[PDB]
Amino acid sequence: GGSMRPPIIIHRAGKKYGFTLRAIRVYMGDSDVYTVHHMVWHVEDGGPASEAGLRQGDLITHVNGEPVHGLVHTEVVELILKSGNKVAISTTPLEN
């Protein structure tokens, strides 16, 4: 795949980061093993995350320098809100 995911610094323009953090615990099958991941379901191409560089349909690996891997639906959101009026969303670029 790729190494060193590039964090996209969004900036809350007095409203929101303009993107949906879809939570999805990817199970490996019938077993209890699963990874708690998240993906931007929809990013508002009107100012925030989109203009920042966040391309819709990307998988978030880290947030503000904190692995999202294992964070619950609201934990990622909080991690972002916690950052302040902005946040470094680490997404996974394309790969062969």
Partner: peptide, 13 residues
């Protein structure tokens, strides 16, 4: 793969 789409709602930023 894919499960928590409803588990937690549809909270966004």
């Amino acid at each position: 793969s894919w499960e928590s789409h409803k588990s937690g709602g549809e909270t966004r930023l």
